[PDB]
Amino acid sequence: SFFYDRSTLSSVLQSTSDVSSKFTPSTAKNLQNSILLTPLPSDIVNNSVLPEQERWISFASPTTQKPPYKTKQDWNFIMFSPFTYYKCDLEVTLSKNDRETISSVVRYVPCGAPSDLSDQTMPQTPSLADTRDPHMWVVGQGTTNQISFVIPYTSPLSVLPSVWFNGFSNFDNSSRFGVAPNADFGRLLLQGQGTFSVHYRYKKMRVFCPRPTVFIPWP
Amino acid sequence: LLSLCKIPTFLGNLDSNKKRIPYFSATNSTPATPLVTYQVTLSCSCMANSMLAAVARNFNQYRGSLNYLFVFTGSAMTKGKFLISYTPPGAGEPKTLDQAMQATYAIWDLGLNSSYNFTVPFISPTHYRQTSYNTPTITSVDGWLTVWQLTPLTYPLGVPNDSHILTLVSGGDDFTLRMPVTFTKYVPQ
Amino acid sequence: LLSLCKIPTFLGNLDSNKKRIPYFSATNSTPATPLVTYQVTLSCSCMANSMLAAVARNFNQYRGSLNYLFVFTGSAMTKGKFLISYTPPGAGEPKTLDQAMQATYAIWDLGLNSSYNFTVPFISPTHYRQTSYNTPTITSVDGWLTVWQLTPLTYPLGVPNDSHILTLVSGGDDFTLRMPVTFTKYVPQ
Amino acid sequence: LLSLCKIPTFLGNLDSNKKRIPYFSATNSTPATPLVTYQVTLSCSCMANSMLAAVARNFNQYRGSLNYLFVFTGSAMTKGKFLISYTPPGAGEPKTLDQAMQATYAIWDLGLNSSYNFTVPFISPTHYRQTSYNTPTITSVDGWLTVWQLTPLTYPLGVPNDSHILTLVSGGDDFTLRMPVTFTKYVPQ
Amino acid sequence: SDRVSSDTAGNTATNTQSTVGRLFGFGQRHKGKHPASCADTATDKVLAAERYYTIKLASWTKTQESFDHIRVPLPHALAGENGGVFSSTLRRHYLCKCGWRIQVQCNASQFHAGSLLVFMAPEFDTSNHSTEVEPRADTAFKVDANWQKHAQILTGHAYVNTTTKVNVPLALNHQNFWQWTTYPHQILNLRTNTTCDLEVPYVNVCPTSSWTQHANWTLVIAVLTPLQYSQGSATTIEITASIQPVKPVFNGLRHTVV
Amino acid sequence: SDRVSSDTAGNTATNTQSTVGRLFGFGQRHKGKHPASCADTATDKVLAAERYYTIKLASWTKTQESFDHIRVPLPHALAGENGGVFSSTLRRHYLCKCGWRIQVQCNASQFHAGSLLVFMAPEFDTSNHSTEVEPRADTAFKVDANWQKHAQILTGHAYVNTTTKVNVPLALNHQNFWQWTTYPHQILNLRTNTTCDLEVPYVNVCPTSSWTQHANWTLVIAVLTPLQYSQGSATTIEITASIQPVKPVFNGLRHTVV
């Protein structure tokens, strides 16, 4: 509980559209304007509309053979998760990467709930705020360019698989073997100008079934 | 809002011309296939306009019994027996009466009382089940309810061959919904 | 997490072809040099892939006993005695059996019981010791554990000359780690 | 006379030259077929000359446990494991180890103790069973006892490849016979 | 001596003469309680299903290296015809919840050397790794026919072609075998024992399992120390296992799966 | 009114609205006690087997005469695939002991006339009588596909050729149907009821049955009064039955029969 109860960089978000506009899923140099809340690798998978949980990590550059990776994850969690399942609440922190006054709207969607990527129902309003889903709105020179909040565990699963899920998620076993169904804490959609880094803090963290850590090259 | 979910409302059955009607037909014969088949999902197009589904669309999960009410509208001189079956998933939809009667079922005999209140027991691997879905999963689709003709509808001369059975649904006594949400918007028409 | 540290896990010994194996060889002779030498540091490349080291890499300091488990895998007909020694630092690594047996040691005799649980006592000028280091210091390196052949492995005809002794490590009963940290990142391969 | 029935006596196994011997052979291999097969009937030609059968021939029915005693006579250096199985009738004789281990069985491991006392439980549709018969019936034939090689007999050099296992039978602790009769006479030879 | 142990289960019984005791994973046992996620009264206490199912697993040769292993997906390893009534009942039920009581067997001699690690692991990848093809229903839950090498799993195995593999440093099906000892286990040291006895309770992401889509438990036999022996000693060394589903409870009766 | 009756058995339930009560043959019920002739602890209380198995039996036409009948050998009538878990468990056991809870169904109208006799009989000949051939395993215990005539059974039916039949006045498989009413029964009078409910305990020459060789119970539906109706009335009149094995207990587990 103590070890994991601290914020670690786990994702990055980017938006080029203003607050008062219709949110539209976009990608730019491996950065989407929405996030899948999970410490495990996530990214657009096979042209999915929104980021899904990945089964492996890839370099962003096709040449370098060096990081950054194109996939989003809590490196500290992936590199050190000596357990098979875990349970916890998630404290999320979202920070603007530069000092320009913030003006953003973020929508939190519970695990597996409808994304609702609909049009604005009223002119010049942030479509992400057009919901009863928990959403945050920060703007002005009185603000400090960041947002933080804590969400409860919302997955329909009792505990989440920390590394691998030896199975399929659908009845015709056609899904991507290795990924559990609804194994996340929901998603974060963002609109407004800027690039934002994301941190995860695992509250009341509980782990089950000890298992191997990621292998490290021999010195 | 649960009060509303418990009010039996009409199911939309398909007419011979693919038109939607609140009943199905039965006559002097016993088909080798079910007269009607409803997949147990609050997402069934079959119950799309029932109060139950209308309310469920605004909630994430449900739990509890479902009541399928059948009302015989044939003549007082018409008799017959139906076998209403609820088949849990895992082995697919029941293909014969032999398969249907191997699952949960009740035999409905016509007579003085006009309707039969059938309950689809809540049989699930999970405590709650999803109200809707993109693709069917083991937590959003729970099997089928099929009504078969056990004995043919029987009657005397001077009686129309086709009898109409009204079909309705609603949540049972221990039915509940939870987690208020907004359903996929659409344009009325 | 200490639970994990106490589970005996394999040490990586070098094969004649510089390949990594979970054991070392012994035969019908008594070398004037140790069969294996492990520097007592949770940083030893020797225990780099043991659960003990894997966990310790995420902590700053340790304290307490270390358990080095040796399991004889030779035949039931093979006999012999080893002298497992723990030499505290200050006068360098022990060069002879005479020097090794002048420090902490236990004589392991083969027989009915297959393994020997050896404990490296926590002997330190400081209450806690570093898990890793840039350059070895008196607070990060604590001496060596060497296993010698006291008497040659002895056996009858029809028995392979080389016996394999499995080697494992883990934290002892009074072993502890503290101060959660992130280890030097690396690229898996 | 029951006292006699409980004294373990020798079974007659077939030699490679169809000669009768009190044991069977086993070696460094695990056949896909049973080493020996005894049909559980006090009429088995296999136990024809055991005291148990000699006494049973003078009685009409039996009831209770049967003890099959196996004594390993191989060298002290020879090891191995057998799977002794008792298959009740109804689905025929077990054709594979997979089938044999699906019925009543015990794994016999060689070592310090030389013999294994195996009991064929009295499993019958009737309280008593016939001692003999013209044609096998469900009251005179009760299945088979087969001994399989679970692991191969293993040993060092200088040891004969074939080990002999003595085989004996007798009535168990709760074994009884009843109704004195005369068996089919024959001419000694 | 105190190492002679017999264990009864239905009409089956295991016997060993070199046991080192039975290890209970998580110090828990499956008590057979019905899943609170199902309204239908479960089918349980089926004596014909609460027994030991014995099967041959593999041949151990000198060529196997440390950490080479054999995997046994559960309950799938017994979902076939040889699963007896446990199988025939399982195939006709949507859900199944149970624990496992297992004994793996392997004998050699006082002159042989080598050791195996016998352990049970939840959510342990059982998919095929000798291909870049997506695992399917009929290839994901099969008992290994050949020993699995160890190198290709330290950092996982992505189901992508060899050239993409270069930009994929880690897959969630990774298994740092250097710590496989953290899983409930026992060691089969040829000089000490010829059997290992384990038992684990029921664990999963939910109350009961839709087994057709998930093999939550995996029995794994990995070599720790390579097999060794001199000219003249028995060369055929085989590994076997007796698997017993502990108090299995079934829910959602339906027609069988094919 | 008091004629509305529902009966639950496992995941099945029968319902009628014209019952005349349930008749218990010999005023006894199978209590499910294990046979004292078997040492092995029986397999019992299998909920998946203690249910109603419903099957179509025959079509009733005006051509049937008094005493023409349909026979349903037990447990064989349910030993096939449609016998569900009762069947799959039965096929894998040497012995089975059980009673029967049965409801035969048949509706017509206030304008139809006729009646059937529904009864259970122990050691009631179920062999084929349309031949002089010896009954065999696959022809002796089958549910009648066609209505059986009555004349050829009053004095029995010897499995001998037609010319020998002349010197054979009586066969032990004789059935004086004029007294079939002495067997536990009920009557299905079209003007009164559309269902009959019976239940019989376990009876046999021994404690438990080697079912593969013996069909101790037989459900029989015979017409007492021929079916009648006028032009215009429904012509398709069919007979059905829901058969439930009462607390079956199994002994002698073995491989399945084919």
Task: Please name the helix (run of DSSP H) or strand (run of DSSP E) that holds residue B86, with its range, or none.
Answer: strand B79-87
Query: What does residue A74 show for φ and ψ, rounded to 5 degrees?
Result: -90, 95
Helix, strand, coil in percent for chain F, rounding step 5: 10, 35, 50
Which of B106, B154, B156 lies closest to F107 in CB terms?
A: B154
Which of C49, C72, C159 lies closest to E178 in CB terms?
A: C49
Which of F14, F54, F236 lies closest to B29 in CB terms?
A: F236
> Range of F45's domain?
1-258
Question: Contact E113/C4, CB-based, under 8 Å?
Answer: no
Stretch 30-49 of chain E: residues touching chain D, C-beta under 8 Å: none
Radius of gyration of chain C (CA): 17
- In sequence order, the 6+-apart residues with CB closer than 8 A to the CB of E20 are E3, E186, E192, E193, E196
**Which of the other chains make 3 or more beta carbon contacts under 8 angstroms with chain F?**
B, D, E
Q: Specify which residues B109 forms β-bridges with.
A: B81
Which of F206, F213, F255 lies closest to D126 in CB terms?
A: F206
What the block records as the tokens of A31 is 């950065």
Stretch 88-107 of chain E: residues touching chain B, C-beta under 8 Å: 92-95
Question: Contact B109/F240, CB-based, under 8 Å?
Answer: no
Q: What residue in A sits closest to B139 (Cα-Cα)? A: A156
What the block records as the tokens of C125 is 């000028």
Strands (E), C3-159: 9-10, 13-14, 20-21, 23-26, 36-39, 59-63, 66-72, 79-87, 104-109, 115-120, 129-130, 144-154
Which long-range CB contacts under 8 A does B12-18 form with residues at least 24 apart?
Answer: B12/B45, B12/B46, B12/B47, B12/B48, B12/B49, B13/B46, B13/B167
Question: Contact B30/F84, CB-based, under 8 Å?
Answer: no
Task: Please name the helix (run of DSSP H) or strand (run of DSSP E) that holds residue D53, with its range, or none.
Answer: helix D51-56
Resolution value in angstroms: 10.6
Q: Could you give the CA distance from residue E242 to residue E122 in angstroms, rounded to a whole number?
A: 19
Which of A76, A210, A217 lies closest to C188 in CB terms?
A: A217
What the block records as the tokens of E33 is 């309680």
Q: What residue in C sits closest to E115 (Cα-Cα)? A: C73
- In sequence order, the 6+-apart residues with CB closer than 8 A to the CB of B112 are none
DSSP secondary structure letter of residue E87: H
Residue with tokens 């987690």: B179
- Count how many pairs of residues, chain B against chain F, have C-beta atoms within 8 Å: 77
Whether chain F lies against chain C with 3 or more Cβ pairs closer than 8 A is no
Strands (E), E106-236: 113-122, 185-189, 195-200, 217-228
What the block records as the tokens of F118 is 């529904």
Residues of B in contact with E252 (CB under 8 A): 88-90, 123, 125
What is the amino acid identity at position B85?
A: S
Residues of B in contact with F109 (CB under 8 A): 77, 79, 154-156
What is the amino acid identity at position D160?
A: P
Question: Contact E254/B123, CB-based, under 8 Å?
Answer: no
Task: Please name the helix (run of DSSP H) or strand (run of DSSP E) that holds residue F88, with its range, or none.
Answer: helix F84-90
Contact A68/E at CB under 8 A: no
Q: Specify which residues A208 forms β-bridges with.
A: A85
DSSP class per residue in F196-238: EEEEE----SSSSB-GGG---EEEEEEEEEEEE--TTS---EE
Tell which residue, E47, E30, E33, E37, has the closest CA to residue E252. E37
Q: Specify which residues B67 forms β-bridges with.
A: B119, B170
Which of D99, D102, D123 lies closest to F38 in CB terms?
A: D123
Q: Count Cβ neighbours within 10 Å for each residue of A89-116 and write b for 16 or more, e otherwise.
A: ebbbbbbbeeeeebbbbbbbbbbbbbeb
Find the distance separating the first CA and the last CA of chain B, reported in whole Å.
Answer: 26
What is the amino acid identity at position F202?
A: Y
Q: Could you give the CA distance from residue D166 to residue D10 in angstroms, rounded to a whole number?
A: 8
Contact D177, D2 (CB under 8 A): yes
Q: Could you give the CA distance from residue C11 to residue C8 in angstroms, rounded to a whole number?
A: 9
3-state secondary structure of C52: helix
C-alpha distances (whole Å) from C135 to each of A42, C87, C129, E11 are 38, 20, 14, 64
Residue with tokens 């440093």: E169
Question: Contact F89/E48, CB-based, under 8 Å?
Answer: yes
Residue with tokens 């506009």: A21
3-state secondary structure of B153: strand
Ramachandran region of residue A65, left (φ > 0), alpha (ψ -120 to 50) or beta?
left
Question: Contact B182/A171, CB-based, under 8 Å?
Answer: no
Question: Contact E41/F47, CB-based, under 8 Å?
Answer: yes
Tell which residue, D99, D178, D106, has the closest CA to residue D143. D99
Q: Could you give the CA distance from residue B10 to residue A218 in angstroms, rounded to a whole number?
A: 69
Q: Could you give the CA distance from residue F180 to residue A141 in angstroms, rounded to a whole number?
A: 100
Tell which residue, F184, F207, F231, F173, has the closest CA to residue F96. F207
Q: Could you give the CA distance from residue A164 to residue B13 in angstroms, rounded to a whole number?
A: 45
**Pairing relationship of beta strands E185-189 and E113-122 according to DSSP bridges:** antiparallel
Contact E166/A at CB under 8 A: yes
- In sequence order, the 6+-apart residues with CB closer than 8 A to the CB of E87 are E78, E79, E80, E81
Contact C180/A at CB under 8 A: yes
D52 to chain E nearest CA, in Å? 26
Residues of E in contact with F85 (CB under 8 A): 89, 92, 253
F43 to chain E nearest CA, in Å? 6
Find the distance separating the first CA and the last CA of chain E, reported in whole Å.
Answer: 48
Q: What residue in D sits closest to E85 (Cα-Cα)? A: D102
Question: Contact F45/E45, CB-based, under 8 Å?
Answer: yes
Contact B83, B148 (CB under 8 A): yes
Query: What does residue A197 show for φ and ψ, rounded to 5 degrees?
Result: -90, 150
3-state secondary structure of E249: strand
Question: Contact D102/E84, CB-based, under 8 Å?
Answer: yes
Q: What residue in B sits closest to F231 (Cα-Cα)? A: B157
Vertex D40: Cα angle to D35 and D45 (nearest 5): 75
- Count how many pairs of residues, chain C against chain E, have C-beta atoms within 8 Å: 87
What is the amino acid identity at position A90?
A: L
Tell which residue, C70, C69, C9, D150, has the closest CA to residue E185. C9
Ramachandran region of residue E220, left (φ > 0), alpha (ψ -120 to 50) or beta?
beta
Find the distance separating the first CA and the last CA of chain C, reported in whole Å.
Answer: 26
CA C155 to chain centre: 26
Q: What residue in F sits closest to D126 (Cα-Cα)? A: F37
Contact E190/C at CB under 8 A: yes
Question: Contact E38/B88, CB-based, under 8 Å?
Answer: no
E224 to chain C nearest CA, in Å? 7
Task: Please name the helix (run of DSSP H) or strand (run of DSSP E) that holds residue B23, with its range, or none.
Answer: strand B23-26
Q: Specify which residues D94 forms β-bridges with.
A: none
Q: Specify which residues F70 forms β-bridges with.
A: F221
Question: Contact E110/C159, CB-based, under 8 Å?
Answer: no
Which of A167, A178, A214 lies closest to E213 in CB terms?
A: A167
Tell which residue, D28, D57, D21, has the closest CA to residue D42. D57
Question: Contact F252/D123, CB-based, under 8 Å?
Answer: yes
Q: Specify which residues A135 forms β-bridges with.
A: A107
Residues of B in contact with F244 (CB under 8 A): none
Residues of D in contact with E109 (CB under 8 A): 77, 79, 154-156
State the CATH number of the domain containing residue E3: 2.60.120.20
Question: Contact B182/A131, CB-based, under 8 Å?
Answer: yes
What is the amino acid identity at position A206?
A: R
Which of the residues F95, F202, F254 would you substitute to probe the D interface, choosing the one with the greatest number of D C-beta atoms within 10 Å? F254
Interface of A with C (CB under 8 A): 2-3, 6, 75-76, 79-80, 82, 210, 212-219
Kindly report the three-state secondary structure assignment for every residue of chain A: CCCCCCCEEEEEEEECCCCCCCCCCCEECCEECEEECCCCCEECCCCCCCCEECCECCECCCCCCCCCECCECCHHHHHCCCEEEEEEEEEEEEEECCCCCCEEEEEEECCCCCCCCCCCCCCCCCHHHCCCCCEEEEECCCCCCEEEEEECCCCCCCCEECCCECECCCCCCCCCCECCCCCCCCEEEEECCEEEEEEEEEEEEEEEEECCCCCCCCC
Omega of the bond leading into A39 within 30 degrees of 0 (cis): no
DSSP secondary structure letter of residue E179: G
Residues of E in contact with D150 (CB under 8 A): 105, 240
3-state secondary structure of C51: helix
C-alpha distances (whole Å) from E36 to each of A5, E90, E92, E207, F185 are 32, 19, 20, 7, 43
Which of the residues D123, D142, D146, D176 would you substitute to probe the F interface, choosing the one with the greatest number of F C-beta atoms within 10 Å? D123
Q: What's the number of domains chain E is made of?
A: 1
Task: Please name the helix (run of DSSP H) or strand (run of DSSP E) that holds residue F89, with its range, or none.
Answer: helix F84-90
Q: Specify which residues A150 forms β-bridges with.
A: A91
Task: Please name the helix (run of DSSP H) or strand (run of DSSP E) that holds residue F15, with its range, or none.
Answer: strand F12-16
Q: Could you give the CA distance from residue D113 to residue B71 in angstroms, rounded to a whole number?
A: 78
3-state secondary structure of E33: coil
Tell which residue, A57, A52, A51, has the closest CA to residue A78. A57
Helix, strand, coil in percent for chain B, rounding step 5: 10, 40, 50
Whether chain C lies against chain A with 3 or more Cβ pairs closer than 8 A is yes
3-state secondary structure of E174: coil
CA E249 to chain centre: 19
Whether chain F lies against chain E with 3 or more Cβ pairs closer than 8 A is yes
Q: Could you give the CA distance from residue B34 to residue B105 in angstroms, rounded to a whole number?
A: 13
Question: Contact E177/A212, CB-based, under 8 Å?
Answer: yes
